[PDB]
Amino acid sequence: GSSGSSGEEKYVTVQPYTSQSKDEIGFEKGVTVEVIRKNLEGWWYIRYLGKEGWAPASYLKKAKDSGPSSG
Contact (Cβ atoms closer than 8 angstroms) between residue 47 and residue 58:
no
- Long-range Cβ contact pairs of 42-45 (< 8 A, separation 24 or more): 44/11
Give 17: exposed, middle or buried? Use CB within 10 Å, 0-12, 13-18, 19+. middle
Number of domains the chain is built from: 1
Cα first-last separation, the chain: 33
Write down the experimental method used for this entry. Answer: NMR
We report the CATH number of the domain holding residue 24 as: 2.30.30.40
Q: Are strands 9-12 and 43-48 parallel, antiparallel or unpaired?
A: unpaired
- Which residues span the domain enclosing 52? 1-71
